[PDB]
Structure 1
Amino acid sequence: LLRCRLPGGVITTKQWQAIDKFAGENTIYGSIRLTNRQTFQFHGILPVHQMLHSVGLDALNDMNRNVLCTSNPYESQLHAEAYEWAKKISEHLLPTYLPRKFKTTVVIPPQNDIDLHANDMNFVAIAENGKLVGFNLLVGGGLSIEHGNKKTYARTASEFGYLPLEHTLAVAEAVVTTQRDWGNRTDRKNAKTKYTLERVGVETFKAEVERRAGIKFEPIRPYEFTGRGDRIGWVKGIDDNWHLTLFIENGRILDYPARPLKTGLLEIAKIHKGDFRITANQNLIIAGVPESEKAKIEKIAKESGLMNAVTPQRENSMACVSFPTCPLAMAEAERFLPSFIDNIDNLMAKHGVSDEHIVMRVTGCPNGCGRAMLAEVGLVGKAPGRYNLHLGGNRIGTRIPRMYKENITEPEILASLDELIGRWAKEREAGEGFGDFTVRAGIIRPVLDPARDLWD
């Protein structure tokens, strides 16, 4: 279990070949596991720092996790600057000791693919005339909970205000230090930023950040999100460039009988002009493909089974690693997701909603790595084969789903969804998401203030 610092999930084709080699020859599993934080993991390492350092990669006292950045913006030209900033914040935050681990993102509306509400500090990019002018700052997200411990809770980030580009690093540093100083000095399970904010208050925390940064926040600049999914397939970039996002189930890159996913990515890496981008949805973008090269790349991806069509449901589902490698796993996640979505796909077809999707996530234990606490339908592992079923989040990921059923099995989960999906298929308003529908139709009460109303 070794993880690399890879801001924005951008990795070169050279770096890819290096990690592909190591993964194959020096680990028990032989796989490359793309994570939902835009980096990769090796499992069962049997020097790695030299191998990493040799291609210019460094694995993260340092409570800082990988800084995320919207991987495939609709306004393609914005990525370069946003990525440059994610990278600078990353280097800037590198060693103070944080009470708990600190997570940061750079978001480019209208996409919340990085799932900002699961993070401590978020910089939402504001652009004027194709140029970034500043960031809206949202602080305090965190999903980790402890079963039956009403003192823990998932929380969404709070808006602090807008800041011109020039103040970015000063503000980033100020949030980190304020949290470091005010974080709970006694208990580890309450030292996270989401808890500090609720203890001292957003305005109190905010005022301190302004004092330390040497700035005064301006009012929030308008922004909205329309989704969190990747743009599977070919999308037109800038110039004559194209981006091919490949759906990779569970982000597990391995050669399977008749689906040489790993070798395929190696073949592509060898002829690929630009680089790759690991997404927050555990997928991979082959970025900067000249129009003339599309066919070459597509042929390989197609042959290798990297372009096998899946339903929109499968593309919008996610699970954490869990067993067999995670020591904290309570129930299967990555290994349960595939057949579970086979079941959900059947249910979607049965109700005539096969072209629809429900943001569905499974996390193997309450730590919440699979980000089930920001899903429309979240499954939270409680024991072997048993999960807590949560409903009521929304497509864009700005609402925490309340627990609907507790410690139930797959057959029980499937029966409840069969029924709920049916009602949604028939009673929903035009373009209404499943999560919103369960809340509208009174199937589940919404979570309006997590620190106070998440638990029944």
Structure 2
Amino acid sequence: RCRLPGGVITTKQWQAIDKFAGENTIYGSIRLTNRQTFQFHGILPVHQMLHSVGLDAMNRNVLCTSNPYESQLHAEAYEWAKKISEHLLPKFKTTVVIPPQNDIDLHANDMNFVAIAENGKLVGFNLLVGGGLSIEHGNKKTYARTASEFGYLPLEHTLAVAEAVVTTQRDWGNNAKTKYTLERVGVETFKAEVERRAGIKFEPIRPYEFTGRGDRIGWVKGIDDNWHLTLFIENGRILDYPARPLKTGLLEIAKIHKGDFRITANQNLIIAGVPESEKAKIEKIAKESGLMNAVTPQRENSMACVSFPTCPLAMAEAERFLPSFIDNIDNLMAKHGVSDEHIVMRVTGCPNGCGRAMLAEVGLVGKAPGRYNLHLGGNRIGTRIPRMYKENITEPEILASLDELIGRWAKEREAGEGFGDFTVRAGIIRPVLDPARDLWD
């Protein structure tokens, strides 16, 4: 795995990793991860390779919103993600987030800097701390937890705050994850120590709201005459398939593209900063390579972790299960006349929770081969943990349940109402209000 703050990778870097994947690995693939970086699988030299193109391999990749609606905020947000990443160089997870997009899934992370603007210019961050999704099956002492608001800081305090949070967690950690430390000592206690160490006092939270977590598939207009093309890549798995030479297509795009690529937190890839006059050339390659094959809104909003064959911790298939599972889900959405809708639906291969099922509207958490715990009642924006609905069930049982529930949603939903919110309103599942205490029935 590569260090790659904000998912930004140059085309020269892309060509190098393309070569290495094809020649020096068992699997031959580039796998985009949901933390805005890439992995090789079955390495057969490697760090030498990364170093040769300026890449290096406690803290994890720092995420940054990939394709903000206010395009002019990206540059400075990314600069700060990079600065934080470099500052924390010698598990802890950090993001920089640009409202109203929560593509980076802030509630899965120990530390989150929510960008605040004054005049289309970044002025500071709200700090949210203590998210983390891992659980141990049946262990009510473990839980997924969302992140808690600490307050606002001007830009000048960013690095000192980042360091204060990371060291406070390292030091106070047992169950050692920030979420557990926060619950044990109290949010106010942790916050006061961060203030002490960073030499600051947090200001009141400044207003922010999120509206979604998805990528912006297709072309969007960026700043100036630039355009960004987001390509949906199923499971982020880049390999040439029959009729769909994804890996070759991306290499060809890398050869002619004038800007960089951006790996998204949804395991997709953005061809970023394309001049308008170059759109047709780029699109032609993408289309002909299968990179722009249309999928349903549902598939665009579904995700799985790697799981088998490479993950030594896997309990059930995730990545390999997802394409056919979503074929079946697409069939259910079509059955019920909601093919244009989506349900944030995620499959994680074990309870460690990499697939971020514990922030989904519908989450499947692997328990054993072919068996998953089915969780319901997250929301579209990812601010609520979904309670377990059915335990240790197979795909046919999951589909039978979802057929019934999606059917009810289609008939009974209010205008614009998400499936997760609906399951809560309709009393199908009880919401989780305070995970450390009420996640587990």
* TM-score bracket for the superposition, by shorter chain length: over 0.9
Given the two structures, how large is their TM-score scaled by the length of structure 2? 1.00
- Alignment match of 2:295 (pick from 310, 324, 327): 310
The Cα shift of 1:203 comes to: 0.3
Tell me how far 1:132 sits from its aligned partner.
0.3
Deviations 1:117-161 (A, max 9, x none): 000000000011110000000000000000001110000000000
Return the offset for 1:47. Answer: 1.2
**Within the alignment, does 1:91 sit opposite 2:81 as a pair?**
no
Q: Distance in 1 between the 2:170 and 2:364 partners?
A: 32
Are 1:238 and 2:223 counterparts? yes
CA distance in 2 between counterparts of 1:449 and 1:14 reads 47
Secondary structure in 1 matching 2:389: strand
Residue 199 (structure 1) shift: 0.2
Q: Using the alignment, how far apart are the partners of 1:238 and 1:213 within structure 2?
A: 35
More displaced stretch, 409-418 vs 172-181: 172-181
Q: SS at 1:58's partner residue?
A: coil
Identity of aligned residues (%): 100
Report whether the alignment pairs 1:64 with 2:49.
Answer: no
C-alpha distance in structure 2 between counterparts of 1:413 and 1:373, whole Å: 17
1:204 Cα deviation after fit? 0.4
Other-structure match for 1:55: 53
CA distance in 2, matches of 1:369, 1:251: 14
Q: Distance in 1 between matches of 2:38 and 2:411?
A: 41
Q: Tell me by how many angstroms 1:368 deviates.
A: 0.4
What's the CA shift string for 1:243-281, capped at 9, x where partnerless?
000000000000001100000000000000000000000
Q: In the TM superposition, what is the alpha-carbon distance from 1:181 to its structure 2 partner?
A: 1.3
Aligned to 1:136: 126
**Displacement of 1:407:** 0.4
Corresponding residue of 1:181? 171
Deviation of 1:75 (Å): 0.4
Name the structure 2 match of 1:360.
345
Matches within 5 A, 1:271-350: 271-350=256-335
**Structure 1 residue 48 displacement after superposition:** 0.7
State the Cα distance separating 1:167 from its structure 2 match.
Answer: 0.4
Q: Which residue of 1 aligns with 2:189?
A: 204
1:331-380 superposed Cα distances (whole Å, 9 cap, x missing partner): 00000000000000000001000000000000000000000000000000
Alignment length, in residue pairs?
Answer: 440
Cα distance in 2 for residues equivalent to 1:19 and 1:211 = 43
Q: Distance in 1 between matches of 2:427 and 2:161?
A: 41
Q: 1:77 and 1:57 mapped to 2: Cα distance? A: 26
Structure 1 SS opposite 2:2: strand
Shift, 1:318, TM fit:
0.1
Partner deviation per Cα, 1:379-419 (whole Å, 9 max, x = no partner): 00000000000000000000000000000000000000000
Mapped partners of 1:129, 1:56: distance in 2: 35
Kindly state the Cα deviation for residue 177 of structure 1 after the two structures are TM-superposed: 1.1
- Give the Cα separation in 2 of the matches to 1:227 and 1:8: 18
Q: CA RMSD in A?
A: 0.3
Q: After TM superposition, where is structure 1 displaced by more than 2 Å over at least 4 residues in a row?
A: none
Query: Partners in 2 of 1:240 and 1:133 — Cα distance?
Result: 26
Aligned twin of 1:252: 237
Corresponding residue SS for 1:349: helix
CA distance in 1, matches of 2:191, 2:382: 23
Distance 1:343 1:180 in 2: 44
Q: Deviations over 1:166-218 (max 9, x none)?
A: 0000100111111111111xxxxx00000000000000000111111111000
Distance 2:270 2:117 in 1: 24
Tell me the TM-score normalized by structure 1.
0.96
Structure 1 stretches lacking a partner, 5+ long = 95-100, 185-189
- Cα distance in 1 for partners of 2:267, 2:285 equals 20
SS at match of 1:412: helix
